[PDB]
Amino acid sequence: ELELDEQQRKRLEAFLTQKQKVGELKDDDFEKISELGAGNGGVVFKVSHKPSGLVMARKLIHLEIKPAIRNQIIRELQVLHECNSPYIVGFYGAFYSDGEISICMEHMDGGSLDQVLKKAGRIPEQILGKVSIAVIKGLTYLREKHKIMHRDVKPSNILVNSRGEIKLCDFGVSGQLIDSMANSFVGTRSYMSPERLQGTHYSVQSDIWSMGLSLVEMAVGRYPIPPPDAKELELMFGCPMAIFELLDYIVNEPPPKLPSGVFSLEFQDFVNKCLIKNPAERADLKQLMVHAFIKRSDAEEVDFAGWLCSTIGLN
């Protein structure tokens, strides 16, 4: 499942070739085009790398720290230069300047799935079939080629583009950045597995739960916890809990599931196997790769780019 198409292979090749001409990234070499979005930790701008004329997505993390620490983070991020896959957002480089860490990556014109969802209302099962394939393959690539696990799978961390590509981003690679950022910068735990929320076991199985939860949210058009009422579902398809309470609910209540009747039994079974509370019983990457839903989706000819462009008004 890590084999590359001819089109994919050619695209990866082209990306590196361009990346080759870039050189050392410097603060003054960038011109801001617009703000792509913000989160807990930093802001992401669409930028122009003046010298190369290349457009990039520049993530700025404001962190006041000493040269020692800063220089450590920058070193850890260098590993991102090794993560090359059609399912991982391209990396250009990282540097520090004027009290802010910069992470420059490939620009994904379709934005994140959380932004796409807001606009679509809800995402069709067939489209989610392609999203599932991409996430599984992205997690597989990270585990296999880098012995890395994502740790932060969620809709805002799944990027898409007008070329119909779906890629993962923001997978923890720098312990230092996490530490220093663990200060005023702390992301949502609402997609974390029950086991991770209990300081218990935590491997790639944890990422599979996050994916399963993200898929349900996208299919129904709302963060699925707690479960919707027969009345909401009725308005949804015709057919406020505090963070700490939400986390307790996740750990103590049964996992969410898709509503029946509206989705295929195969899709329902797929998410169910991703959402089994017990990580030992929960399906693994290898099993998911051959799941009926995945096999069916893979063989389907879905024009993701077309659906995407018309959905968000791209163009």
Ligand X SMILES: Nc1ncnc2c1ncn2[C@@H]1O[C@H](COP(=O)(O)OP(=O)(O)OP(O)(O)=S)[C@@H](O)[C@H]1O
Q: Which residues belong to the annotated binding site for K-252a? A: 106-108, 156
Residue 99 CB, nearest approach to Mg ion (Å): 21
Q: Which stretch binds ligand X (CB under 6 A): 110-118, 227-235, 250-258, 300-308?
A: 110-118
The reply to whether 36 sits near ligand X by the rule CB under 6 A is: yes
Selected from 72, 102, 126, 157, the binder of ligand X by CB under 6 A is 157
Closest separation between CB of residue 179 and Ca ion, Å? 26
- Token pair for residue 161? 């583009």
Binding-site residues for ATP, in ranges, read: 36-44, 59, 105-108, 112-115, 154-157, 170
**Residue 129 binds which entry of ligand X, Mg ion, Ca ion, none, CB below 5-8 Å type-dependent:** none
Kindly state the tokens that stand for 140: 């597989």
Q: Which two tokens stand for residue 19?
A: 């990346």
Query: Does 117 sit near ligand X (CB under 6 A)?
Result: no
Kindly name the residue from 28, 152, 229, 269 that is annotated as catalytic.
152
- Which class for 53: exposed (0-12), middle (13-18), buried (19 or more C-beta within 10 A)? exposed
- Shortest Å distance, C-beta 207 to ligand X: 15
Six-digit token pair at 197?
Answer: 């929320």
The CA angle 281-278-222, to the nearest 5 degrees, is 110
Q: Could you tell me which of 101, 243, 89, 91 has the C-alpha nearest to residue 181?
A: 101
Residue list for the binding site = 36-44, 59, 105-108, 112-115, 154-157, 170-173
What one-letter code names the amino acid at 214? S
Whether 151 and 204 have beta carbons less than 8 Å apart is answered as no
Least distance to Na ion, CB of residue 89, Å: 22
Give the Cα separation of 195 and 251 in Å (integer): 8
Q: Is 152 an active-site residue?
A: yes
With respect to Ca ion, which residue has the nearer C-beta, 30 or 209? 30
The CA distance from 236 to 47, in Å, is: 38
Instruction: Give 24 or 28: the residue with its C-beta nearer to Ca ion.
Output: 28
Residues known to be catalytic: 152
